[PDB]
């Protein structure tokens, strides 16, 4: 057979922090360190289908913070797509797993998930995750 009820999930690991206004965000974050955060994502979750994850894309963002005492806001992130993820609830033989994007993202990235409707400027925890459906109704297997 074929299981045609899997989804592709766009995932993003975020570190948002403040730095002194005379510094640059690239003194704190590197493409190398963000790639190593990606390597720490769980790649064998019970909800994971075949074909693993896309190439990770590191990103560094900087802006002066109006509300801070002379500080800049740094947003260091690494994004990738989980090509094939199960839909619904999944029984692995011993227990149930919720394969919804929020609980799936939190298990795989290990940080609290926030809906894309909540902007980075309205999130006050330092480490968090993003996850949303980028493709629905894909095969769960690689064929
Ligand atoms: Zn198939
Ligand atoms: Zn299949
Ligand atoms: Zn960091
Ligand atoms: Zn970082």
Author numbering: -2 to 140
The paper states:
A small secreted protein with 37% amino acid sequence identity with AvrLm3 was identified from F. fulva. The analysis of the anomalous signal revealed the presence of two Zn-clusters in the structure that resemble those of the Ni-ions in AvrLm5-9. One Zn-cluster is bound near the N- and C-termini and involves histidines from the native protein and from the linker peptide and side chains from a crystal neighbor. Strands β1 and β2 are connected by a peptide composed of a helical turn and a short helix surrounded by irregular peptides. The long connection between strands β3 and β4 contains a β-hairpin, a short helix and some irregular peptide stretches. The sequence alignment and structure superposition show conservation of all 10 cysteines, suggesting both proteins form an identical set of disulfide bridges. The sequence similarities between AvrLm5-9, AvrLm4-7 and Ecp11-1/AvrLm3 are relatively weak (between 18 and 28%). Nevertheless, the 3D structures of all these effectors are strongly related: AvrLm5-9 and Ecp11-1/AvrLm3 share the same fold with AvrLm4-7, which displays suppressive interactions with AvrLm5-9 and AvrLm3. All three effectors have a disulfide bridge that connects the N- and C-termini, and also at least one disulfide bridge that links the helical connection between β1-β2 and strand β3.
The Dothideomycete Leptosphaeria maculans, causal agent of oilseed rape stem canker or blackleg disease, is one of the fungal pathogens in which suppression of ETI by the presence of an AVR gene has been demonstrated. Among them, AvrLm4-7 suppresses Rlm3-mediated resistance triggered by AvrLm3 and Rlm9-mediated resistance triggered by AvrLm5-9. Surprisingly, despite low sequence similarity, AvrLm5-9 and AvrLm3 are structural analogues of AvrLm4-7, sharing an anti-parallel β-sheet covered by α-helices. Structure-informed sequence database searches identified a larger number of putative structural analogues among L. maculans effector candidates, including the AVR effector AvrLmS-Lep2, all produced during the early stages of oilseed rape infection, as well as among effector candidates from other phytopathogenic fungi. These structural analogues are named LARS (for Leptosphaeria AviRulence and Suppressing) effectors.
